[PDB]
Design a protein around this motif. Structure first.
Motif, PDB file in Angstrom:
ATOM      1  N   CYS A 121      81.390  44.652  77.831  1.00  0.00           N
ATOM      2  CA  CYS A 121      81.320  45.728  76.836  1.00  0.00           C
ATOM      3  C   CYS A 121      81.889  45.250  75.495  1.00  0.00           C
ATOM      4  O   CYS A 121      82.997  44.651  75.447  1.00  0.00           O
ATOM      5  CB  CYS A 121      82.109  46.935  77.319  1.00  0.00           C
ATOM      6  N   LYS A 123      76.286  42.601  72.209  1.00  0.00           N
ATOM      7  CA  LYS A 123      74.933  42.352  72.757  1.00  0.00           C
ATOM      8  C   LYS A 123      73.895  43.194  72.041  1.00  0.00           C
ATOM      9  O   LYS A 123      72.851  42.641  71.611  1.00  0.00           O
ATOM     10  CB  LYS A 123      74.918  42.636  74.252  1.00  0.00           C
ATOM     11  N   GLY A 177      75.390  49.843  80.233  1.00  0.00           N
ATOM     12  CA  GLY A 177      75.606  50.844  81.288  1.00  0.00           C
ATOM     13  C   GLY A 177      76.711  50.455  82.267  1.00  0.00           C
ATOM     14  O   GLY A 177      77.799  50.032  81.829  1.00  0.00           O
ATOM     15  N   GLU A 227      78.432  48.494  85.567  1.00  0.00           N
ATOM     16  CA  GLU A 227      78.389  47.267  86.385  1.00  0.00           C
ATOM     17  C   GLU A 227      78.170  47.738  87.821  1.00  0.00           C
ATOM     18  O   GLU A 227      79.096  48.369  88.428  1.00  0.00           O
ATOM     19  CB  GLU A 227      79.674  46.474  86.231  1.00  0.00           C
ATOM     20  N   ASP A 229      69.374  43.725  90.537  1.00  0.00           N
ATOM     21  CA  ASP A 229      69.214  42.260  90.768  1.00  0.00           C
ATOM     22  C   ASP A 229      67.818  41.861  90.269  1.00  0.00           C
ATOM     23  O   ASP A 229      67.663  40.782  89.639  1.00  0.00           O
ATOM     24  CB  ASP A 229      69.301  41.925  92.253  1.00  0.00           C
ATOM     25  N   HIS A 275      81.860  34.592  85.814  1.00  0.00           N
ATOM     26  CA  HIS A 275      81.253  35.616  86.698  1.00  0.00           C
ATOM     27  C   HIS A 275      79.734  35.654  86.437  1.00  0.00           C
ATOM     28  O   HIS A 275      78.921  35.692  87.359  1.00  0.00           O
ATOM     29  CB  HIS A 275      81.902  36.964  86.412  1.00  0.00           C
ATOM     30  N   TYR A 276      79.323  35.674  85.169  1.00  0.00           N
ATOM     31  CA  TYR A 276      77.893  35.737  84.848  1.00  0.00           C
ATOM     32  C   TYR A 276      77.201  34.456  85.329  1.00  0.00           C
ATOM     33  O   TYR A 276      76.084  34.563  85.816  1.00  0.00           O
ATOM     34  CB  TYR A 276      77.691  36.007  83.367  1.00  0.00           C
TER      35      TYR A 276
END
Ligand SMILES: *CCC(=O)N1CCN(c2nc(O[C@H](C)CN(C)C)nc3c2CCN(c2cc(O)cc4ccccc24)C3)CC1
Ligand SMILES: Nc1nc2c(ncn2[C@@H]2O[C@H](COP(=O)(O)OP(=O)(O)O)[C@@H](O)[C@H]2O)c(=O)[nH]1
Ligand SMILES: [Mg+2]
Length: 169
Positions: free
Chosen positions: A12, A16, A60, A62, A69, A95-96
């Motif tokens: 967040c 983006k 939005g 997570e 997916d 993580h990404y």
């Protein structure tokens, strides 16, 4: 017409939505609803090739439904966006990397690391640390500001060039 599916990921507030609206409309947004996740289209010429960019601006909640997916899996390349004033957003990039590897089932997924909000004086993530991370991943690193438009074209166009490199293999 050649089409490239790009996915813009990151915590967040990293910018983006602001990067996406900059690319598309050449305007900087002070507020963009953080609940709106959707794909945008933009026709571009990159290295002489006319193409359609399909840009998924992630947002939005997570959550990890099979449907979410599948949305993310449509991506041919990922912009890994952190903000230079937000250490946690930088710590989230790992993580990404893990989630992109999972949904694409590949250690060779086109990606660009993007350090946004380069215009702010309140830096907490050193450029050197971001360059070292991108080197470790074998991906480009681009400094951006959605506010000044520094690096915005370069971030998206570099990702398209990474996808082309993948398509050659
Ligand atoms: C402020 C609203 C916003 O822009 N977004 C909310 C947070 N979203 C995600 N956040 C995270 O992880 C955060 C940065 C750190 N957490 C707390 C550990 N991870 C994801 C999202 C959106 C969903 N993403 C997701 C979901 C599925 O099912 C599969 C894949 C595959 C590859 C990449 C992401 C992904 C994970 C969105 C932004
Ligand atoms: N100063 C500055 N502010 C930015 C930049 N990019 C986004 N913002 C601001 O940061 C906030 C979050 O941006 P947003 O695009 O909504 O981030 P997202 O949650 O990642 O979509 C908004 O107030 C934007 O105006 C940037 O490069 N520089
Ligand atoms: Mg947003």
């Amino acid at each position: 017409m050649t089409e490239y599916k790009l996915v813009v990921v990151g915590a967040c507030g990293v910018g983006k939505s602001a990067l996406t609206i900059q690319l598309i409309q050449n305007h900087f947004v002070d507020e963009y609803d953080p609940t709106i996740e959707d794909s945008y289209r933009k026709q571009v010429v990159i290295d002489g090739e006319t193409s359609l960019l399909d840009i998924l601006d992630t947002a939005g909640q997570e959550e990890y439904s099979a449907m979410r997916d599948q949305y993310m899996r449509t991506g041919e390349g990922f912009l890994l966006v952190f903000a230079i004033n937000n250490t946690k957003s930088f710590e989230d990039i790992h993580h990404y990397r893990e989630q992109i590897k999972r949904v694409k089932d590949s250690e060779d997924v086109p990606m660009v690391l993007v350090g946004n909000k380069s215009d702010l004086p309140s830096r907490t993530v050193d450029t050197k640390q971001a360059q070292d991370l991108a080197r470790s991943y074998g991906i480009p690193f681009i400094e951006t500001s959605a506010k000044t438009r520094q690096g915005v074209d370069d971030a998206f166009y570099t990702l398209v060039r990474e996808i082309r490199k993948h398509k050659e293999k």
